PDB file of C-alpha atoms in Angstrom:
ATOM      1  CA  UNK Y 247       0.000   0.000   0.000  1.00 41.83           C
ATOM      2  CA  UNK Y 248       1.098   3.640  -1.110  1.00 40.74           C
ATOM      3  CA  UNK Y 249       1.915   6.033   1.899  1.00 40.02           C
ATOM      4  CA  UNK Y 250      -1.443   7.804   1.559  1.00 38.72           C
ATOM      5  CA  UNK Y 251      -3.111   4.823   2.416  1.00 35.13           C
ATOM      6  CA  UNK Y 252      -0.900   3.840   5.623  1.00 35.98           C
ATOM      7  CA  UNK Y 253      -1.286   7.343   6.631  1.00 36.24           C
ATOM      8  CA  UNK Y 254      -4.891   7.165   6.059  1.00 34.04           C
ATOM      9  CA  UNK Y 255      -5.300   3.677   7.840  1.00 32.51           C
ATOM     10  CA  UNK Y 256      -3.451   5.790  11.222  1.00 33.09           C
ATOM     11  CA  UNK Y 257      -6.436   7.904  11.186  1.00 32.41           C
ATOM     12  CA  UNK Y 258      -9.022   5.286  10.760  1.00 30.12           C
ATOM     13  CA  UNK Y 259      -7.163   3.510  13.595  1.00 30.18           C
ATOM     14  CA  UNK Y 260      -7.130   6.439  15.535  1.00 27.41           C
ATOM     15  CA  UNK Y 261     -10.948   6.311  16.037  1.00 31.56           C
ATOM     16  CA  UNK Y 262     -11.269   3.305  16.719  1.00 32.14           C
ATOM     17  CA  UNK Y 263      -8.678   3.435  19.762  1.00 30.39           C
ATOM     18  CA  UNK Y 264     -10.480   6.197  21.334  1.00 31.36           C
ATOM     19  CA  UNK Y 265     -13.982   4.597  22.297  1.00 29.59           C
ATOM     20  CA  UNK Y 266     -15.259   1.588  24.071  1.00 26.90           C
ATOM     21  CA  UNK Y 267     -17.675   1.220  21.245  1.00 26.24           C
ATOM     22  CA  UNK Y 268     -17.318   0.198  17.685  1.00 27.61           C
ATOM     23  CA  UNK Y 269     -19.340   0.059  15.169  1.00 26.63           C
ATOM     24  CA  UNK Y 270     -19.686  -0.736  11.439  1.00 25.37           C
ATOM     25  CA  UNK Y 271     -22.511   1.096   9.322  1.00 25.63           C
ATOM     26  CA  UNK Y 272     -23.951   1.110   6.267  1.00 23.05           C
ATOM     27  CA  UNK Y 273     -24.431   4.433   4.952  1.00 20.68           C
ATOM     28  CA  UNK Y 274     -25.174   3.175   1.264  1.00 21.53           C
ATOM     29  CA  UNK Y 275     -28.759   4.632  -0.730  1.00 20.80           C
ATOM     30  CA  UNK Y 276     -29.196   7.999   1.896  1.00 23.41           C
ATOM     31  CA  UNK Y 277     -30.438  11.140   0.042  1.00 23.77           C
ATOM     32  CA  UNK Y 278     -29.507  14.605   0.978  1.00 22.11           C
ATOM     33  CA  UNK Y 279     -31.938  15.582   3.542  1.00 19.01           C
ATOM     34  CA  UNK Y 280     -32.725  12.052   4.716  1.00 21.07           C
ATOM     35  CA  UNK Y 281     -28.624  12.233   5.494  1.00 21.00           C
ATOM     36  CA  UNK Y 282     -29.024  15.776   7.287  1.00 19.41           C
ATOM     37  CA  UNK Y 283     -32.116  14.707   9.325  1.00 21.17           C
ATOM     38  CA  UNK Y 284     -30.185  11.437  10.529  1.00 18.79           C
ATOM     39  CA  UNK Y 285     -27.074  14.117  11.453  1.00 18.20           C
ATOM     40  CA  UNK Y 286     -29.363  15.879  13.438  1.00 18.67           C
ATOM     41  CA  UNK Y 287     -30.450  12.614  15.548  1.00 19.69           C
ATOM     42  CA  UNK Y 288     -26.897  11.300  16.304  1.00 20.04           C
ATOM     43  CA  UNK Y 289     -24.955  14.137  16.058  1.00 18.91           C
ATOM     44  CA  UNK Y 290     -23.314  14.912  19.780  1.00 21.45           C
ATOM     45  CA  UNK Y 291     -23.520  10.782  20.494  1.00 20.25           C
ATOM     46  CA  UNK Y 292     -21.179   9.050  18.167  1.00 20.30           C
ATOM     47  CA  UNK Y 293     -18.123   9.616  15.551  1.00 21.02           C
ATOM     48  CA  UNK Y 294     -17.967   8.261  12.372  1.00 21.22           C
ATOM     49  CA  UNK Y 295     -15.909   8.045   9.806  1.00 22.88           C
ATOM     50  CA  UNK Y 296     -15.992   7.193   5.953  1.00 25.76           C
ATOM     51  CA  UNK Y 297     -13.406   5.425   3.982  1.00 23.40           C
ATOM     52  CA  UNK Y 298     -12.836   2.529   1.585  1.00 24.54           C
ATOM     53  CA  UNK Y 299     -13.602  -1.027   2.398  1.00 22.31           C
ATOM     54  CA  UNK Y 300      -9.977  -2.355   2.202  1.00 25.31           C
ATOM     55  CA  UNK Y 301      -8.697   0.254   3.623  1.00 25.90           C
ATOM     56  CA  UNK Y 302     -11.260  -0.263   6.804  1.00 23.49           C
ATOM     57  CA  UNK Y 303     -10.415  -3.949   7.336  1.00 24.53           C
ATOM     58  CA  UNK Y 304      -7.261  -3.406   7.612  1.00 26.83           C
ATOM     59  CA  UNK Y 305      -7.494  -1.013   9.988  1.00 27.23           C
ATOM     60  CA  UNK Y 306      -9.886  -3.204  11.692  1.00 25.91           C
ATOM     61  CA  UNK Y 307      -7.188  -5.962  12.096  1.00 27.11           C
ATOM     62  CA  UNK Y 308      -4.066  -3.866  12.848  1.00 26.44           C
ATOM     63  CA  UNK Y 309      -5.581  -2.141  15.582  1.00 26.06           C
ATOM     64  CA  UNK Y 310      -7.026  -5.341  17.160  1.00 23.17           C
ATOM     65  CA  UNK Y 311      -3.259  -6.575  17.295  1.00 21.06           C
ATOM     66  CA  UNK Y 312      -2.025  -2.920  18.401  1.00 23.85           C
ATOM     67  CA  UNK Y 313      -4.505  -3.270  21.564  1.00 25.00           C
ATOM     68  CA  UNK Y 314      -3.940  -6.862  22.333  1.00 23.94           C
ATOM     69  CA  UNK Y 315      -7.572  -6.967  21.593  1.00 27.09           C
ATOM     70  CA  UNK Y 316      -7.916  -9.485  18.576  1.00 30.63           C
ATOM     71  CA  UNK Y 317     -11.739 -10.417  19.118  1.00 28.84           C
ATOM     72  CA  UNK Y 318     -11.734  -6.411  17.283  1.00 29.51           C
ATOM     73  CA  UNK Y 319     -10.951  -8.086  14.279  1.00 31.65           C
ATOM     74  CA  UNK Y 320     -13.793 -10.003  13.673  1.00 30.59           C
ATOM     75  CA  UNK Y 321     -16.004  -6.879  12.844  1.00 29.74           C
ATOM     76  CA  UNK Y 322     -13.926  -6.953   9.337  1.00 29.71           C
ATOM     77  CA  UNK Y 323     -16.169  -9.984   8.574  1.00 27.27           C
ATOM     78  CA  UNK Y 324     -19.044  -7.617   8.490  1.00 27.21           C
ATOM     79  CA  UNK Y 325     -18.090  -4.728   6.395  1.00 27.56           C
ATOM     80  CA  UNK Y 326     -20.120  -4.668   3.049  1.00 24.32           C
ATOM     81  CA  UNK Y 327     -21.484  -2.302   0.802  1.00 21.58           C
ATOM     82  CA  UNK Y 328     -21.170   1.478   2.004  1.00 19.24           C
ATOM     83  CA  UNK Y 329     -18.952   0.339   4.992  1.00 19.38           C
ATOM     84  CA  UNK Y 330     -18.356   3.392   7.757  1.00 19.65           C
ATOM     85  CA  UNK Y 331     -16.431   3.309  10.884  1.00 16.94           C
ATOM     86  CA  UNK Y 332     -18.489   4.326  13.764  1.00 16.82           C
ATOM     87  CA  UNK Y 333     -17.385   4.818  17.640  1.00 17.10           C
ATOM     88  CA  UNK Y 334     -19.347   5.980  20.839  1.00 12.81           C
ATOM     89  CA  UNK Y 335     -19.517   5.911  24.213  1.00 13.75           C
ATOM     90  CA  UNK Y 336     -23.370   4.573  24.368  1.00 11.46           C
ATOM     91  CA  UNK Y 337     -23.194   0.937  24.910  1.00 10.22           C
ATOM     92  CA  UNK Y 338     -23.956  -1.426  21.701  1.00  9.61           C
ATOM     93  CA  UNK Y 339     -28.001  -1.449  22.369  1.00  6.59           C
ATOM     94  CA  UNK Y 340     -28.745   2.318  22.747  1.00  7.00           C
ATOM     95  CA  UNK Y 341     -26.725   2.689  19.655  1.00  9.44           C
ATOM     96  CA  UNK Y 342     -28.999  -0.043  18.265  1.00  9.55           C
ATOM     97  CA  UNK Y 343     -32.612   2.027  19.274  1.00  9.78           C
ATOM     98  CA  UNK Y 344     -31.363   5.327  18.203  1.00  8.81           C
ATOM     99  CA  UNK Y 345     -30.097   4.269  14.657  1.00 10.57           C
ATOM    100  CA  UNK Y 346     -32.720   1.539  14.031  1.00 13.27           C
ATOM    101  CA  UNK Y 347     -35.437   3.265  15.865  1.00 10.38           C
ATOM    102  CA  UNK Y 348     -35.264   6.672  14.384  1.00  9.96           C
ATOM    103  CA  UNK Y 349     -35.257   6.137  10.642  1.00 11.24           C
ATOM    104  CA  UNK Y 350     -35.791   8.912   8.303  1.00 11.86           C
ATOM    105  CA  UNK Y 351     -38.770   8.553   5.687  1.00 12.97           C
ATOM    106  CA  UNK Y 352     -37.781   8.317   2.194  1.00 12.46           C
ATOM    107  CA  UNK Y 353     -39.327   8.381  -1.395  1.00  9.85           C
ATOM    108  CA  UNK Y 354     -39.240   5.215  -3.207  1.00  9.75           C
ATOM    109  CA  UNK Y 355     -36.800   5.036  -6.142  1.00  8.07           C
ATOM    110  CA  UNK Y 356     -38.035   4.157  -9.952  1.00 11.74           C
ATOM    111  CA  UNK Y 357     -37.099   0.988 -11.011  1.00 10.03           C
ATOM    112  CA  UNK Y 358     -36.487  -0.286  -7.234  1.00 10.90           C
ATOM    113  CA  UNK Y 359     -38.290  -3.114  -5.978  1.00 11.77           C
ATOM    114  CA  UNK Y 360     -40.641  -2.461  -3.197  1.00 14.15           C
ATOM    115  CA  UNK Y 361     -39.499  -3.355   0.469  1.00 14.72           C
ATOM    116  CA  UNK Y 362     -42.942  -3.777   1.780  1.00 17.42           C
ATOM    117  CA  UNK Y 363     -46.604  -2.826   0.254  1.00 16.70           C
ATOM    118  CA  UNK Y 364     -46.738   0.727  -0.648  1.00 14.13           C
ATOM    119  CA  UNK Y 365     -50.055   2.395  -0.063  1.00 15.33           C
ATOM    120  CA  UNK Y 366     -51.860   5.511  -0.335  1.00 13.87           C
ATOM    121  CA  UNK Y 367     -54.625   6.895   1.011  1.00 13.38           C
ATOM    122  CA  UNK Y 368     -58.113   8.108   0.447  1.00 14.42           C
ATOM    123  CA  UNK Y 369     -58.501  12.135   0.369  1.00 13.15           C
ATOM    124  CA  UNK Y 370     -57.577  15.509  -1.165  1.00 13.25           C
ATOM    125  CA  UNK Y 371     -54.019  15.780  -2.578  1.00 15.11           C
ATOM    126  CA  UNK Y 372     -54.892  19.934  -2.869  1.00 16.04           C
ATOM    127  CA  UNK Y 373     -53.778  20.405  -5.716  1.00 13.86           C
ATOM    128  CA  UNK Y 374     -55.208  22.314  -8.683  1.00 15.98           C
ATOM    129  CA  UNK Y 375     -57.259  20.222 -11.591  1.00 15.52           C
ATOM    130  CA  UNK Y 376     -55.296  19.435 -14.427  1.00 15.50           C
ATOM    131  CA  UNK Y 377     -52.567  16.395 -15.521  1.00 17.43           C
ATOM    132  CA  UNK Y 378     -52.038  15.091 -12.549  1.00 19.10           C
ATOM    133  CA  UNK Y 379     -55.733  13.773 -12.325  1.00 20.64           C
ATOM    134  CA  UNK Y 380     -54.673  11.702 -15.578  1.00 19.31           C
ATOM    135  CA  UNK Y 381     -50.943  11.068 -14.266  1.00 17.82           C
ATOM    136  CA  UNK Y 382     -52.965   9.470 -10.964  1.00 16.99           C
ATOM    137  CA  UNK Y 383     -55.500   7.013 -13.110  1.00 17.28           C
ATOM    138  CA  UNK Y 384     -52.502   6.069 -15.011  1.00 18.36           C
ATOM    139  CA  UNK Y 385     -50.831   4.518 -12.330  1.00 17.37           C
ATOM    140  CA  UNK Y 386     -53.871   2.358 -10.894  1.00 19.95           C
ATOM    141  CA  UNK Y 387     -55.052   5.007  -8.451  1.00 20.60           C
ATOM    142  CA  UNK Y 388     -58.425   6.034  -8.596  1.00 19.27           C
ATOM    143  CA  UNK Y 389     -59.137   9.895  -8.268  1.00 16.51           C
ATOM    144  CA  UNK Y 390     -61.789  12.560  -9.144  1.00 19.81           C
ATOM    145  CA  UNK Y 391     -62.091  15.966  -8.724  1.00 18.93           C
ATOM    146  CA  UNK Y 392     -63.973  16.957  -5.618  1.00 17.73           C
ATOM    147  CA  UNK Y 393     -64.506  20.492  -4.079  1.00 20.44           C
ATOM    148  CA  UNK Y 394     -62.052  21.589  -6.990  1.00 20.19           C
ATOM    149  CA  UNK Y 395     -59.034  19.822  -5.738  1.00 19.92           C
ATOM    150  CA  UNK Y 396     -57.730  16.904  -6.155  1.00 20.95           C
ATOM    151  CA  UNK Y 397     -58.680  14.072  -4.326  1.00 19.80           C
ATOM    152  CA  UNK Y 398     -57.550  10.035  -4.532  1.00 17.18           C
ATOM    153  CA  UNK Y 399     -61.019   7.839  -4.008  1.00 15.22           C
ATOM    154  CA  UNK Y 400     -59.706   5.019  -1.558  1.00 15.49           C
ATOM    155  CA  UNK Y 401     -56.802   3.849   0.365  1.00 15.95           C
ATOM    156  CA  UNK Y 402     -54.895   1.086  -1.943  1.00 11.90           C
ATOM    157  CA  UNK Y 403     -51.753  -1.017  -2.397  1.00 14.36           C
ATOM    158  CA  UNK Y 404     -50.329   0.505  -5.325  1.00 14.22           C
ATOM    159  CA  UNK Y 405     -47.452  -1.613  -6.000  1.00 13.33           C
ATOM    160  CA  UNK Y 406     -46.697  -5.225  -3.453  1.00 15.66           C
ATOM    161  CA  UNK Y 407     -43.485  -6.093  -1.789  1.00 14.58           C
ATOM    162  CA  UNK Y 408     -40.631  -7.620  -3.877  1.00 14.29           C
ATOM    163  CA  UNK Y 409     -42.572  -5.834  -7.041  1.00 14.25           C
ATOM    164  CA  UNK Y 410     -40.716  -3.225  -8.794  1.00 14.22           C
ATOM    165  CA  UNK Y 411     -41.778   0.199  -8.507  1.00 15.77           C
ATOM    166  CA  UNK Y 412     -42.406   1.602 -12.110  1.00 15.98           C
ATOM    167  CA  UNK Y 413     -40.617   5.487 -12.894  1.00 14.90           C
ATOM    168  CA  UNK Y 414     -44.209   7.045 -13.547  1.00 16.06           C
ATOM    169  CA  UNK Y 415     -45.601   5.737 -10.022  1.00 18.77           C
ATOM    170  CA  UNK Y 416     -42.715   6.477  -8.248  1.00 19.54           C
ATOM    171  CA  UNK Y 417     -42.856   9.663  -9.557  1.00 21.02           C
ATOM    172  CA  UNK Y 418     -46.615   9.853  -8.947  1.00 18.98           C
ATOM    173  CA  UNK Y 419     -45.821   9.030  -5.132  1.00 17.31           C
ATOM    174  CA  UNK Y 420     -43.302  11.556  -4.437  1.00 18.80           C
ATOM    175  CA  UNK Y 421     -45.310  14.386  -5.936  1.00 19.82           C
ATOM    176  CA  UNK Y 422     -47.889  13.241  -3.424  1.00 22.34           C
ATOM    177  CA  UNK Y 423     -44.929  13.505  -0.763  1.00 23.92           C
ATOM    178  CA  UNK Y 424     -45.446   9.702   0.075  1.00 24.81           C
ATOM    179  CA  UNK Y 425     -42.326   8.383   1.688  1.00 24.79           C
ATOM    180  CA  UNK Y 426     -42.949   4.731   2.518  1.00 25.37           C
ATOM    181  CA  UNK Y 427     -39.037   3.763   2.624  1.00 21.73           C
ATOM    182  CA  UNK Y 428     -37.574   3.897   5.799  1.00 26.16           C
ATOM    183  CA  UNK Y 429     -33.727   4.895   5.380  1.00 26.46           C
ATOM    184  CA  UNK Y 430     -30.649   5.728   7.340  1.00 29.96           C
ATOM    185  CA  UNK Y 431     -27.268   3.959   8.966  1.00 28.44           C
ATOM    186  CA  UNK Y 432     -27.826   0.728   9.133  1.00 28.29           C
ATOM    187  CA  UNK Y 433     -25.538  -1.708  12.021  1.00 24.38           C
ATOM    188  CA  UNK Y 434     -23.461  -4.423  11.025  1.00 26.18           C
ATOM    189  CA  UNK Y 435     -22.282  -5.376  13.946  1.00 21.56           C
ATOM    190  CA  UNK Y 436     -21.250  -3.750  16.941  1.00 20.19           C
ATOM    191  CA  UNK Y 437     -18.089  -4.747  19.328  1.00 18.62           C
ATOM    192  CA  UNK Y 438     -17.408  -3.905  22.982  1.00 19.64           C
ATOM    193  CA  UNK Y 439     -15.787  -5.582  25.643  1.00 22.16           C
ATOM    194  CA  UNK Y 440     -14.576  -8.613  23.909  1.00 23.59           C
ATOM    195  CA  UNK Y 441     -17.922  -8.973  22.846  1.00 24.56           C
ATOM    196  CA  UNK Y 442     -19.041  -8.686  19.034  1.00 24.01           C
ATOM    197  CA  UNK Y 443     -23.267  -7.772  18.542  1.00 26.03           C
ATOM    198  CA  UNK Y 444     -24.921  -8.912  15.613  1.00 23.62           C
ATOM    199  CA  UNK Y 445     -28.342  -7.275  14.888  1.00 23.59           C
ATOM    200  CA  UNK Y 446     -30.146 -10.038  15.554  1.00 24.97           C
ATOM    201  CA  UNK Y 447     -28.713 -10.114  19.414  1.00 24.49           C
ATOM    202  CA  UNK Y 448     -29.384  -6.799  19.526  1.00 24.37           C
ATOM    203  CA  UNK Y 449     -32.638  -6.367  18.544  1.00 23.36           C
ATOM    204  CA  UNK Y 450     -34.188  -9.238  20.535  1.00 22.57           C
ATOM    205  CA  UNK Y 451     -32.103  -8.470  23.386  1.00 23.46           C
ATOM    206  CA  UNK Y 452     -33.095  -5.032  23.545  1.00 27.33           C
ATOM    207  CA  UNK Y 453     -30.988  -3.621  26.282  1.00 27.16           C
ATOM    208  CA  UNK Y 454     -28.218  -3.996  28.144  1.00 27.36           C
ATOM    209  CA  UNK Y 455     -27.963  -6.337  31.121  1.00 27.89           C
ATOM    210  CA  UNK Y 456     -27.354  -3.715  34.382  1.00 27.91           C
ATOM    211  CA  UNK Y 457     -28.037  -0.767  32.005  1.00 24.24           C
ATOM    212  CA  UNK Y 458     -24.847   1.377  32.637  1.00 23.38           C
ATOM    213  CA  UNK Y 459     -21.843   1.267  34.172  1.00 23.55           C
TER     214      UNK Y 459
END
């Protein structure tokens, strides 16, 4: 490896010396304000920093051999996609709530396939007559024109999970300001104490034993 990426490894290594807590996120598929509103929520509680895969595994593994701490290691198994270091001082299940808890609603994507049944509901949209009344039918949902707005007819599944979500419904939904995807940094795994959390231990779990320390 070229200097810039030893010297970059230091830093990465840095971080993860300086808290009990370590964490590896996904930050992959996060829009612009979807980003700032999850900056907002975990601003002044954790540290996190972005870098390239290889470059985070390796910094993974040399610091678990600089601390005497090789059970540190292991979190390199987990890094995939959008990767991102992430330290704290809030022990492995509060990090859990607030990033899994507190997601930020986002549009759904045309041409993505549908995490769960999208829906939308019965009522006025507001808006003016014109296109959009056509743009609506077009898309399989049902709308009229009713005290001069307007207005979808019923609630309705508009597209099921594991379907893909066609361009002119997606962009039907977001003009409605529908934002059935929920998005934000998503744990890999989370290490403390010679311990390494998976999601699954932390989410049935819930909390730790004893709370704090």
């Amino acid at each position: 490896m070229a200097p810039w990426k030893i010297e970059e490894v230091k830093t990465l290594k840095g971080l993860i010396k300086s808290k009990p807590v370590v964490a590896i996120v996904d930050m992959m598929d996060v829009p612009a304000p979807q980003l700032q509103e999850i900056r907002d929520k975990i601003r002044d509680k954790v540290k996190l920093r972005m870098s390239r895969n290889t470059l985070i595994i390796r910094a993974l593994k040399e610091a678990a051999e600089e601390l005497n701490n090789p059970k540190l290691a292991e979190l390199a198994n987990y890094v995939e996609r959008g990767a991102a270091i992430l330290v704290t001082d809030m022990n492995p299940f509060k990090l859990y709530k607030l990033l899994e808890e507190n997601k930020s609603p986002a549009p759904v994507r045309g041409g993505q396939i549908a995490p769960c049944d999208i829906k939308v509901e019965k009522g006025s949209t507001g808006m003016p007559p014109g296109p959009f009344l056509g743009e609506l039918k077009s898309v399989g949902i049902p709308a009229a024109i009713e005290k001069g707005k307007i207005a979808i007819k019923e609630d309705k599944v508009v597209v099921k999970k594991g379907e893909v979500v066609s361009p002119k419904l997606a962009a039907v939904l977001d003009r409605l300001g529908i934002k059935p995807i929920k998005v934000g940094l998503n744990i890999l795994a989370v290490y403390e104490d010679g311990i390494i959390y998976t999601p699954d231990v932390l989410k049935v779990d819930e909390e730790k034993l004893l709370a704090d320390i």
